[PDB]
Design a protein around this ligand. Structure first.
Ligand SMILES: O=C(Oc1c(Br)cc(Br)cc1CNC(=O)c1ccccc1[N+](=O)[O-])c1ccccc1
Ligand SMILES: O=C(Oc1c(Br)cc(Br)cc1CNC(=O)c1ccccc1[N+](=O)[O-])c1ccccc1
Lengths: 166, 166
């Protein structure tokens, strides 16, 4: 993990940094990731530093639909430092239901979001999806790697913030 | 850990919450802790919300000597979300050397500080010291529990920010 952080901090460019972070997620056993970060006092959710390998057409749709205002992981990130697991119970509103359905059609069904709060007031999220036969298998996988992930998100936040905002 | 968090969340008052957080640290192998938290925007280190079992007279001395402007873990917390271990190389200025020597006379020589950055802009530190026979042993210990500690500091922040400012 620390060697991963060192590779992140020796990377030259957004593309390289993204490739290293994706590989670190993938080595941990996740399949898709999205690292998103805004500068301090921005909720300008389109003009964020966004990196990872979610389907391009899903990312476009998420912006066009205004899903930053619906996605329950986003409001959760504004209120907590703790992870929020993509459980059926987090989708409550009708819009949140439609969100779940469309993300699911995008292959994003099981996973978690780690909120990111940087030392200069950066606000973000690291979301990671997992391929699994069922939610039970998914949840067990995520519990087995949660301590590594919890360290990873802070190493990603610290390196990423310097890359995004220099 | 999560049970520990749920206990913190069910607790009433600063006293019970302290006792729970101290026991969680002690169970993990650390003898002394300080959990320190400021509201958004404050740089008022002497009126920080403070919990733990550091010797009272060391806390008094820190306040009276203005060590918040000296203590190298404090500048680090303002810049980073990553832990900072109490290695001799972090003490660089003459005043920093005096601070190392005085902290050490208090029994606070081996340890680390986890920066705390909350979702409403709270700024803090969870410092934990370890009673070991020497620094080599303390560092072995701390490496072996680091991933638990890294999740712990965030649960403590999420619960304790409520306790401090809500
Ligand atoms: O990255 C952020 O949000 C974004 C941005 Br923007 C674009 C996109 Br696409 C996605 C997110 C975060 N949500 C998720 O990853 C997520 C969560 C639960 C179920 C399904 C999804 N999903 O998208 O498949 C973000 C940045 C700063 C602050 C808060 C959020
Ligand atoms: O609590 C904070 O700082 C405080 C406050 Br105030 C009072 C006191 Br006493 C201590 C700290 C934090 N330093 C340490 O724990 C520390 C670090 C390295 C070696 C020795 C010690 N030590 O003190 O024995 C704090 C709060 C917000 C942001 C940064 C720091």
């Amino acid at each position: 993990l620390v060697d991963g952080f060192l590779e992140l901090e020796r990377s030259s460019g957004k593309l390289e940094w993204s490739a290293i972070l994706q590989k670190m997620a993938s080595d941990l056993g996740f399949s898709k990731i999205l690292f998103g970060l805004l500068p301090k006092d921005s909720q300008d959710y389109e003009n964020a530093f966004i990196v990872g390998n979610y389907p391009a057409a899903w990312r476009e749709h998420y912006d066009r639909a205004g899903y930053a205002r619906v996605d329950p992981t986003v409001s959760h990130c504004t209120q907590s430092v703790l992870p929020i697991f993509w459980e059926p119970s987090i989708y409550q509103t009708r819009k949140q239901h439609e969100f779940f359905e469309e993300a699911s059609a995008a292959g994003l069904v099981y996973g978690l979001t780690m909120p990111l709060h940087g030392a200069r007031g950066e606000l973000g999220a690291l979301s990671l999806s997992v391929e699994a036969e069922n939610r039970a298998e998914a949840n067990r996988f995520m519990e087995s790697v949660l301590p590594t992930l919890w360290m990873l998100k802070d190493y990603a936040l610290q390196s990423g913030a310097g890359l995004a905002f220099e």
